[PDB]
Amino acid sequence: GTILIDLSPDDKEFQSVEEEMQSTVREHRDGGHAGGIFNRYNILKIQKVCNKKLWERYTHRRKEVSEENHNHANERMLFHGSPFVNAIIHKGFDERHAYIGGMFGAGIYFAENSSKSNQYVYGIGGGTGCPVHKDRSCYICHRQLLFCRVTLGKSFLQFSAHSPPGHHSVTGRPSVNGLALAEYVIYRGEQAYPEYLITYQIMRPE
Ligand SMILES: Oc1nc(-c2ccc(C(F)(F)F)cc2)nc2c1CSCC2
Numbered sequence: 462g463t464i465l466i467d468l469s470p471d472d473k474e475f476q477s478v479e480e481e482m483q484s485t486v487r488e489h490r491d492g493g494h495a496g497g498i499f500n501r502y503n504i505l506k507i508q509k510v511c512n513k514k515l516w517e518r519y520t521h522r523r524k525e526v527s528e529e530n531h532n533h534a535n536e537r538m539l540f541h542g543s544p545f546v547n548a549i550i551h552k553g554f555d556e557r558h559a560y561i562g563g564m565f566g567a568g569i570y571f572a573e574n575s576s577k578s579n580q581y582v583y584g585i586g587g588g589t590g591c592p593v594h595k596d597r598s599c600y601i602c603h604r605q606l607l608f609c610r611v612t613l614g615k616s617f618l619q620f621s622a623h624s625p626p627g628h629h630s631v632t633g634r635p636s637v638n639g640l641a642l643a644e645y646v647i648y649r650g651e652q653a654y655p656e657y658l659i660t661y662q663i664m665r666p667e
C-alpha cells in the first residue's frame with residue numbers, strides 16, 4: 462500500500478526536513494570509520510512515505526501510549542538508518558529491524574543526530590560500506606535515511622526485548638561526549654512511522 466510522493470526543494474516541508482538533516486551532523490568518536498568523513502550532505506531527494514494501513518497502526522498505538530501517560534504521547538521526529546529501509550517503508554517497523562546487539566537491548570534504535578543513523582546505512586558499524594566500492598566513506602553512492610515520527614511515551618533514562626516495567630521506551634543520554642545528542646529505543650514497531658525517505662550523498666570536506 463505504500464506510495465512515495467516527491468517533495469519539491471521549493472516546498473517548506475522539504476526545507477525543514479533538510480535543515481534537520483544538515484544541522485544534526487556531528488563528529489564521531491570513530492573518526493568516521495563506520496559512517497564516512499563528512500560535515501554535511503548533498504540532499505538528492507526527500508519523499509513523503511504514505512501508507513494508510515501503517516499510519517493507522519502507528520496512531521492506534523500512539524493513543525494507547527498517550528492514555529497510559531496523562532494524554533502525552535511524547536512524540537519525536539528522529540532519524541533511522543538501516544539496510545532494511547525498503548522493507549521498512551513497505552511493511553512497517555517490526556522485529557526484523559531491531560538492533561539485537563544494541564546497548565539498551567534488542568529493540569529499534571533512533572537518533573537525534575542524522576550522522577549517527579548514517580553509521581547504520583550499510584549495516585552495523587557501517588558493514589563493508591557501499592555495495593559498489595566497499596567503501597564506508599563512499600562519496601559517490603546514493604544513501605537513504607528515514608526521518609521517523611516516534612512515540613516515546615514515558616521513557617527510561619539511561620546515562621552513558623521489553624521496555625522497562627512502566628515505561629514505553631528507553632532514552633540514551635550521552636554522558637562523556639559533550640556534543641552527542643540523544644539516542645532512543647522502542648520495543649514495538651507500531652511506535653514508529655517512517656514519514657520521510659531521504660536520499661543523499663555524504664560530501665567530502667575541503
Ligand atoms: O539509525 C540507527 N540504526 C540502527 C540500526 C539499524 C539496523 C540494524 C540491523 F541491521 F537491523 F541490525 C541495526 C542497528 N541503530 C542505531 C541507529 C541510530 S541510534 C544508534 C543505533
Ligand SMILES: [Zn+2]
Binds near residue numbers: 592593594595596599
Ligand atoms: Zn560506493
